[PDB]
Structure 1
Amino acid sequence: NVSSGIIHVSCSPNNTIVSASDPGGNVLCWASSGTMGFKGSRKKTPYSAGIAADKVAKTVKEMGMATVKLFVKGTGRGKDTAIRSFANAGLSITEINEKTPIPHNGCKPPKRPR
């Protein structure tokens, strides 16, 4: 029911999540790897993120969307297959942005696994 908006993709190094959102900030629909069939360690694959973005793009096509912002977030190899699927799904993408949670050198991160 809304022409414009922002759809977010978070690419964790263990999972991926995509969430459509109204331009006001509130979300409209969202899917992820877990919502689909395969789960576990097999869900951190570029194919998983690609199909996750494909599903949300398809279900927002019936939701009546148009040119939409896109905020990639997180570190991981699945953040590009979602981009390609969004481009291939037939969307009206116009703007690309990056919204990583980049910190200034403040709080201490967890320890090195070794």
Structure 2
Amino acid sequence: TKFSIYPPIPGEESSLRWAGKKFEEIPIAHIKASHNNTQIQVVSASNEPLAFASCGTEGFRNAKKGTGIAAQTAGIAAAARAKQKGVIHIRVVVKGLGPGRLSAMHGLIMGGLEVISITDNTPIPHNGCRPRKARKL
């Protein structure tokens, strides 16, 4: 068949399935990639938290949290905890432009989870609040 990068539309019956589940039912891996930290949380389609992880929770502290390896470790831990609850396929929803933005996904892959879709939810203000002044460095 012809693969389309566009996600299947909720409310429309698609042939695509994963473990006998529809795309609307696949659990959701929210990734937040800040400059100083990276947080990962898996939730069900019904917004039920199943696993959470972060660089700080994995023992890394201060500047060491900003490394990509910390985000990879967080992804590994989150994937292990989610897989303990039966999570197999996930939809990745990544926000922020932190160093671990991709590494966390790799960790999930290393954790055993299968990523079927990558979604960017970076909060981009359509001319919203005023950011802080530029650093004089």
Structure number with greater CO (CA < 8 Å, separation at least 6) is: 1
| Percentage of matched positions with identical amino acids | 35
What secondary structure sits across from 2:63 in the alignment? Answer: helix
CA RMSD of aligned residues (A): 1.5
Q: Which runs of 5+ in 1 are unaligned?
A: none
In our comparison, the structure showing a higher alpha carbon Rg is 2
**What CA distance in whole angstroms lies between the structure 2 residues aligned with 1:52 and 1:104?**
31
Deviation of residue 72 (structure 1)? 0.5
Show the counterpart of 2:100.
78
Give TM-score, length-normalised by structure 1: 0.89
Deviation of residue 81 (structure 1)? 1.1
Show the counterpart of 1:44.
66
Greater CA drift, 85-94 or 29-38: 85-94
Q: Report if the CA contact (8 A) 2:75-2:111 is conserved.
A: no
1:1-114 counterparts in 2 under 5 A? 4-114=26-136
**What CA distance in whole angstroms lies between the structure 2 residues aligned with 1:92 and 1:83?**
10
Give TM-score, length-normalised by structure 2: 0.75
Q: Report if the CA contact (8 A) 2:80-2:112 is conserved.
A: no
Q: Which runs of 5+ in 2 are unaligned?
A: 1-24
What secondary structure sits across from 2:60 in the alignment? Answer: coil
